[PDB]
Amino acid sequence: GAMAETVFKQNHAASGFLAGRYDAQAMSPTMFNWSRESRFTSTADGALKWEKNVPATPQNGAGAAVDGDGTVFIQSKDGKLTAYHPDGTVKWVTENLGTTYTLTPVLGTNGVIYLPSHDKKLYFIDKETGNILWSVPLSGAPSSDAAIGPDGTLYVSTLDNYIYAIKPTSPGTATQKWKFKTNGVVGSAPVLASNGTLYTATYNNIFYAINSGTGQVKWSKTTSNGFKGYPVIDRDGTVYAGNQDGNLYAYTSTGAVKWTFPLNGFSSSSLAIDHNGNVYIGSGSGELFSISKTGNMNWSFYTDGPVRTAPLIDADGNVYFGSDDKNVYAVDADGNEKWRYQTDSNVISSPVLAEDGTLYVGTYTKLLAFGAK
């Protein structure tokens, strides 16, 4: 289909994700393993453009992807993957793809969607048509989105306590590059840094730095409680990870503690990082935090329930997020409220921006679209 007018980049000057084989022509091909600072501006003012019924239980704030045409792809817990036109009408639908929990339909190159399924499978789906190209079995249910490496390898965690590195070779060879048995249930989903390290962590309180070429552990640390969600990585290779003990931890690429930052409650979302190195995270306290690269609070913004959406930053520094108080929120770069929108289900499916500034965000029951002013 069409291409976005500028290429998608996982990184800006202040982030340090491993560049992988994502659809560079897409508007938003991945939810995580990128800065979550959009290259697009938005004038969205809080007026709803449309809503669709999309029943879901997204893992760690998973949600929609958007290709170069602006087609919106989202999985629902009734077994469907649906492609929506920008006007909210349906372009295609494929059924029987997995229930109970949903994940992001990540867009790779050559128009392939990578969708792990609760049926213990990894689907490869044609984004133009919805056709299932083929699928690979997994030994346990997947507990992460598919991260894509520079050679096309897919990295996922599974519920039977593994990190998998799966290399697909067209038209139908799927190869275990390596598999790592973790000590405990994976709570921190795999993200990859520019130096080749994959980071993950378990509820036996172990945080791992793994060589993504070999699957061998580089170093590990234990903590009092478990990390959860998707960390962000800065340009120096420092990893910022939210912990259930109520702190954000910053670990350097060598495993040194750069700092910790208190969140007043369990970490409740995954992170974003802006091009000035500020990092953003939600808390079970109800607050969204903006924190500097040196660990100082820039601001906090209170909501009436846990903030479980990973925040999204636009090109002007505005921050979009949602809360278990059932509001979508937009604030400016200094934390000033711009608008809120009251819906009827907790806002937990993380926001996505299209090229024209349309903002998509989801609840347990709905996909919401907020148009430009």
Which 8-state DSSP code applies to residue 111? G
Residue 130 CB-half CA count within 13 A: 18
Main-chain phi, psi angles of 75, to 5 degrees: -95, 140
- State how beta strands 327-331 and 337-342 pair: antiparallel
Q: Locate 122 and state its tokens.
A: 């990894």
Domain count, the chain: 1
Q: Does the residue 38 lie in any domain?
A: no
For residue 289, count CB atoms less than 10 angstroms from its CB and return exposed for 0-12, middle for 13-18, buried for 19 or more: buried
Neighbours of 254 (CB within 10 A): 10
* Rounded Cα–Cα distance for residues 261 and 310 (Å): 17
Name the 3-class secondary structure at 27.
Answer: coil
SS3 per residue for 207-244: EEEEECCCCCEEEEEECCCCECECCEEECCCCEEEEEC
Within a domain: residue 111? yes
Is 17 part of any domain? no
For the chain, the first-to-last Cα distance in angstroms comes to 27
Tell whether 135 is covered by a domain: yes
CB 320 within 8 A of CB 312: yes
Please check whether residue 199 lies inside any domain of the structure.
yes
Task: Provide the 8-state DSSP code for 295.
Answer: S
Round the CA-based radius of gyration of the chain to a whole number and report it.
19
Candidates 310, 303, 309, 271; CA nearest to 287 is 303
Length of the chain in terms of residues written = 373
Q: Are 102 and 114 in contact (CB under 8 A)?
A: no
Residues 138 and 120: beta-carbon distance below 8 Å: yes
Which spans in the chain are helix H? Answer: none
Question: In the PDB record, what is the listed experimental method?
Answer: X-ray
Place of tokens 């994940």: 103
- CA atoms of 207 and 215, how far apart (whole Å): 14
Structural domain that includes position 197? 48-370
Backbone angles phi, psi at 227, to 5 degrees: -80, 150
Distance between CA atoms of residues 43 and 282, nearest Å: 23
Asked, for residue 32, whether it belongs to a domain, the answer is: no
In a domain, 23, yes or no: no
225 touches 268 (CB < 8 A): no
The resolution in angstroms reads 1.5
Long-range Cβ contact pairs of 116-120 (< 8 A, separation 24 or more): 116/142, 116/144, 116/145, 116/146, 116/156, 117/142, 118/142, 120/158
* Residues β-bridged to residue 320: 312, 330
Q: Assign residue 80 the CATH number of its domain.
A: 2.130.10.10
Do 265 and 225 touch, CB atoms closer than 8 A? no
Closest CA to 218 of 233, 208, 227: 208
Read out DSSP for 148-177? E-TTS-EEEEETTTEEEEEEEETTTEEEEE
Q: Give the phi and the psi of residue 109 in degrees, each rounded to 5.
A: -75, 170
Compute the distance between CA of residue 99 and CA of residue 80 in angstroms, rounded to an integer: 8
Within 10 Å of residue 24's Cβ, how many Cβ atoms? Answer: 17
In-domain check, residue 35: no
Q: Which residues contact 336 (CB under 8 A, 6 or more apart)?
A: none
